[PDB]
A paper describes a structure:
The replicative DNA pol from bacteriophage RB69 (RB69pol) is a member of the B family and is responsible for DNA synthesis of both leading and lagging strands of its genome. It has extensive sequence similarity to human replicative pols α and δ and therefore has been regarded as a good model for B family pols. Our previous reported 1.8 Å resolution structure of wt RB69pol showed that L415 is located right below the triphosphate tail of the incoming dNTP, where a small hydrophobic cavity exists at the tip of the L415 side chain. To provide a structural basis that could account for the different kinetic behavior observed among L415 variants and wt RB69pol, we determined the crystal structures of three ternary complexes: dTTP/dA-with the L415A mutant; dATP/dT-with the L415G mutant and dATP/dT-with the L415M mutant with resolutions ranging from 1.80 to 2.04 Å and Rfree values ranging from 21.3% to 21.9%.
Replacing L415 with either Ala or Gly greatly enlarges the size of this cavity. In particular, the change of the metal ion A position in both the L415A and L415G ternary complexes are mediated by an alteration in peptide backbone. Therefore, the 0.5 Å downshifting of the metal ion A from its optimal position observed in the wt RB69pol structure would cause misalignment between the 3′-OH and Pα, possibly reducing the rate of phosphodiester bond formation. This could explain why the kpol values for incorporating a correct dNMP by L415A and L415G mutants are 5- to 25-fold lower than the kpol for wt RB69pol. All three mismatches can be modeled perfectly well into the NBP of L415A. The major difference between the two mutants was that the L415A mutant incorporated incorrect dNMPs 5- to 7-fold more efficiently than the L415G mutant. By replacing L415 with either Ala or Gly, the enlarged cavity provides extra space for nearby residues, such as L412 and Y416. Thus, the increased freedom of L412 and Y416 provides this extra flexibility for the incoming dNTP and allows it to adopt non-Watson–Crick geometry with the templating base. In addition, a water molecule is observed in this hydrophobic cavity when L415 is replaced with Ala or Gly. Our tCo-tCnitro FRET assays show that replacement of L415 with Ala or Gly abolished the pol’s ability to differentiate fully complementary P/Ts from P/Ts with a mismatch at the P/T junction.
Numbering used by the authors: 1 to 901
Write the structure that this text describes.
DNA sequence: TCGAGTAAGCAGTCCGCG
DNA sequence: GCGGACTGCTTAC
């Protein structure tokens, strides 16, 4: 097999590389890599190396990496550009793996671990590590085993061994319900003392050294705790054994307020699953506790226990160990579904970077572009410093707030990447500038043609047309991968809808789910077999289809993220190819494209409707238009349609056969106007929206920019078994809005769009009457909590104190003195509740850590003093009043003459 | 919240507005 | 009471 790296590091003048050799075995090597860098030279000097602008360079070969770094510094002292890849390990990977890497994941040791630390006096700080580590569960992907290290004797209690038999039993048997599928995979090791536990863990780690190291909060908690505890007991040299090269660095990480420490383990790639989840999941969660996320992702019940976690080991060591094991398993289950490790490996090997660098699109793209240029013997420019400067973005149309009955939407496929490719925007394709007219003049096609030679953006920039830039070339490659995965995702989605339909008529039989590839649209034969299947088999198939859809979603949306982040990197001062001229060329072209096509669509529809000045485009944001279809439906007449699906078909056909060709003609003209390299503006239909045929539903409404709801029957070619709400920006979509309130507002919206005013009024009246019975967590607001210290003046709110921070200060006074009470962590999320006048907490609100029950010390009093009236008004009535006033509906029945009878 | 970008919405504070 | 200046937070692209 072809060799591939596992990890790479620079340590002084050596590269340390762990790799898989041609026989599939893990090896390590130290290489005295001599890096090269480059300086500009005279034309009279014969060279093969040129910078991206075509200027000749001489290659400087250094005796070692330190010599190279020193040269860069002296070049700065002289005032001359030092060209080339200054991150020497990326140059090493490029030289050592000069081919497309094919990796074999089965050979990569992926370790997933979690530790337990009993602490009586509050949160056990990793930097201090003052308490014994009393459990470690470490799952190894190569062995497929859970290695459990269990401390039986501690200063906080001596306990009996954990029992695998009880662990396996149902909770109704007094057991722990450790999943039966992992029972046989547990290797249990009890220890009489912590010193032996840790020495054995280190010997184990040496034998089975992680390449990828993951878990939940492993980077911020488990790793620094283990390192520091070992350091405290044995000394630094022993703790450094967590690195295969015995090198570690305390790394200080900082944002806007304050900083924290992590331990860099040289020769390991730490991908903390909480951070993978945050970057790649496209959620914003009220809580990031593993319990909360596991419940959300997997629909598994919260791991229940009596009393605080600080007393769990002494009171129920059995459950304590089983819960540690289950926690490790939960992360593996989340990864089986979301596949973020697979994503990271794919992206990392594609770019030829340390796998942990997938968190940085700047590093990822720097490596991709360097590798690409190096292939042509071209030399990358030196990174420079730039001051942070603002630049303009997208155009968003101001919608008239209203109900909108029939709507068809359209938006550009990968808009900004497509603009980059179409215009040929790249650092080395800049050709010059032209005199800019006001944007309105380009939108209306009255400005003079920018260039008859070069490809243009309405910000004034011109680009070469003779050859593709490296940015267009490389962005296209990732875009093509994105397109492939999106195809699989949508097929799985369409397949899911087939199963949902079949589930209306399940067969009374005993059978099996069909063995199929959900990434491909079901054949006629498969469809026929599905119609004969039982509910059990159909539901299993649906689950599998939905898992395939999620897998495709991860692969496609994060490739979309990668290419969109190349655009974004052009506007980040740390990117080697930072250039506000190029970032603004993209955004200004975007503004033109949207407004140009708005004009074209309005013109087209006015023509086919025989009107003048009618605005068919009611809204658009960045690269999208929303077209009112009322007049199209009315041209045929509603009574002509057999059912909802009939008019959906009709609008679908109209969009595909009439609208899209008109849109395409419009953009081709724009391409010619701007003299672009290639027409790539592809504005495909997104949604077909409207009320159910014959209902009183309003179909859709807008309240403002970035705030709307549509009742959708077809989304990008997926014809739903049941209509689905597309809601953007409204409170149902915000993580700050209480859970039960999101749910209620969504049902209000459903009723508005599908059923009408009277249905809405019925539901509202019921919710208002019953909501005080809702569990307090479900009606609590959520907020991130930054700068608690800033607004804390002797335990009381300082000037301009935010509402949620005020709540935290209230909480802090109420739990004062107790080291046992959960502390609100700076920068994390809190639940927030309003409190009635005269309450014993002495302020108008209280906040506590999100994803948790408020501590028993104050729970009863919070429950007694919760201000339900304020809750309802702020979170439910105010937003609902917004939706209904926009839609020109009333959520409460107004008086009429009929009342008199 | 270490980690690519801008536009733009709403909650809340402070305080004017005769 | 609402609206502007401002902070804080969050979402649509
Ligand atoms: C979602 C998103 C969009 N954008 C910008 C670039 C996008 O091309 C543009 C339009 O956003 P989208 O319409 O959300 O995405 P897209 O057009 O790139 O891809 P597709 O519609 O095919 O799924 O907005 C970002 O810069 N960052 C982002 O995270
Ligand atoms: Ca735990
Ligand atoms: Ca788009
Ligand atoms: Ca599309
Ligand atoms: Ca059937
Ligand atoms: Ca869009
Ligand atoms: Ca009490
Ligand atoms: Ca206001």
């Amino acid at each position: 097999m072809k060799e591939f790296y596992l990890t790479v590091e620079q340590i002084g003048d050596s590269i340390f590389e762990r790799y898989i050799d041609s026989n599939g075995r893990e090896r390590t090597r130290e290489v005295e890599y001599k890096p090269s860098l480059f300086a500009h030279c005279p034309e009279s000097q014969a060279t093969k190396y040129f910078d991206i602008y075509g200027k000749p360079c001489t290659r400087k070969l250094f005796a070692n990496m330190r010599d190279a770094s020193q040269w860069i510094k002296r070049m700065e002292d002289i005032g001359l550009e030092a060209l080339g890849m200054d991150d020497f390990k990326l140059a090493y990977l490029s030289d050592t793996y000069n081919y497309e890497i094919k990796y074999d994941h089965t050979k990569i040791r992926v370790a997933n671990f979690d530790i337990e630390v009993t602490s009586p006096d509050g949160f056990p700080e990793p930097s201090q590590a003052k308490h014994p580590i009393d459990a470690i569960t470490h799952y190894d992907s190569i062995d497929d085993r859970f290695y459990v290290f269990d401390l039986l004797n501690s200063p906080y209690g001596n306990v009996e061994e954990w029992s695998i038999e009880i662990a396996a039993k149902l909770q109704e048997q007094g057991g722990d319900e450790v999943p039966s599928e992992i029972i046989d995979k547990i290797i249990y090791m009890p220890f009489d003392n912590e010193k032996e536990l840790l020495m054995e863990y280190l010997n184990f780690w040496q034998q089975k050294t992680p390449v990828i190291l993951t878990g939940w909060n492993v980077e911020s908690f488990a790793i620094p705790y283990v390192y520091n505890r070992i350091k405290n007991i044995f000394g630094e040299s022993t703790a450094k054994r967590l690195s295969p090269h015995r090198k570690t660095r305390v790394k200080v990480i900082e944002n806007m307020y304050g900083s924290r420490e992590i331990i860099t383990l040289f020769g390991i790639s730490v991908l903390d699953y909480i951070d993978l989840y945050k970057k790649f999941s496209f959620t914003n969660q009220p809580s990031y506790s593993l319990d909360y996320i596991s419940e959300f992702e997997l629909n598994v019940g919260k791991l229940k226990y009596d009393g605080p976690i600080s007393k769990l080991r002494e009171s129920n060591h059995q459950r304590y160990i089983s819960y540690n094991i289950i926690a490790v398993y939960r992360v593996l289950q989340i990864d089986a579904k979301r596949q973020f490790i697979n994503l990271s490996l794919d992206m990392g090997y594609y770019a030829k970077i340390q796998i942990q660098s997938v968190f940085s699109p700047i590093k990822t793209w720097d490596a991709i572009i360097f590798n690409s240029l190096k292939e042509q013997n071209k030399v990358i420019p030196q990174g420079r410093s730039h001051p942070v400067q603002p630049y303009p973005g997208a155009f968003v149309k101001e919608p008239i707030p209203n109900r909108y009955k029939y709507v068809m939407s359209f938006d550009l496929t990968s808009a900004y990447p497509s603009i980059i490719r179409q215009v040929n925007i790249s650092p080395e394709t800049i050709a010059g500038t032209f005199k800019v007219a006001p944007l309105h003049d380009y939108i209306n096609a009255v400005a003079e043609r920018p260039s008859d030679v070069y490809s243009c953006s309405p910000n004034g920039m011109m680009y070469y047309k003779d050859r593709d830039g490296v940015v267009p070339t490389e962005i296209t490659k990732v875009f093509n991968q994105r397109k492939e995965h999106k195809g699989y995702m949508l097929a799985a989605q369409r397949n899911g809808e087939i199963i949902k339909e079949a589930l209306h008529n399940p067969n009374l039989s005993v059978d099996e789910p069909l063995d199929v590839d959900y990434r491909f649209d079901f054949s006629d034969e498969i469809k026929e077999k599905i119609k004969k299947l039982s509910a059990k088999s159909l539901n299993e198939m649906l689950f599998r289809a939905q898992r395939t859809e999620v897998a495709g979603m991860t692969a496609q949306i994060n490739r979309k993220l990668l290419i969109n982040s190349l655009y974004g990197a052009l506007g980040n001062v740390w990117f080697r190819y930072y250039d506000l001229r190029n970032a603004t060329a993209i955004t200004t072209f975007g503004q033109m494209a949207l407004q140009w096509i708005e004009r074209k669509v309005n013109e087209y529809l006015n023509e086919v409707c025989g009107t003048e000045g009618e605005a068919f485009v009611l809204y658009g944001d960045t690269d999208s238009i929303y077209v009112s279809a009322d007049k199209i439906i009315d041209k045929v007449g509603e009574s002509k349609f057999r059912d909802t699906n009939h008019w959906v078909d009709f609008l679908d056909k109209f969009a595909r056969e009439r609208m899209e060709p008109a849109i395409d003609r419009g953009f081709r003209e724009m391409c010619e106007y701007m003299n672009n390299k290639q027409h790539l503006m592809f504005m495909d239909r997104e949604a077909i929206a409207g009320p159910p045929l014959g209902s009183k539903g309003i179909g859709g409404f807008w309240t403002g920019k970035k705030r709307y709801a549509l009742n959708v029957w077809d989304m990008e070619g997926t014809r739903y078994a049941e209509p689905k709400l597309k809601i953007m920006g409204l409170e149902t979509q915000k993580s700050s809005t209480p859970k039960a309130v999101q749910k209620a507002l969504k049902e209000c919206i459903r009723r508005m769009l599908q059923e009408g005013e009277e249905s809405l009024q019925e539901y509202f009246k019921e919710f208002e009457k019953e909501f005080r019975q809702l569990n307090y967590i479900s009606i609590a607001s959520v907020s991130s909590a930054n700068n608690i210290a800033k607004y804390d003046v002797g335990g009381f709110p300082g000037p301009k104190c935010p509402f949620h921070i005020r709540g935290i200060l209230t909480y802090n006074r109420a739990i004062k003195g107790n080291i046992d009470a959960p502390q609100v962590v700076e920068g994390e999320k809190v639940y927030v509740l309003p409190l009635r006048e005269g309450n014993p907490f002495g302020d108008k609100c209280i906040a506590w850590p999100s994803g948790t029950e408020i501590t028993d010390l104050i729970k009863d009093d919070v429950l007694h003093w919760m201000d339900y009236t304020v809750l309802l008004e702020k979170t439910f009535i105010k937003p609902l009043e917004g939706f209904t006033s926009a839609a020109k509906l009333d959520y409460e029945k107004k008086a009429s003459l009929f009342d008199m009878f």
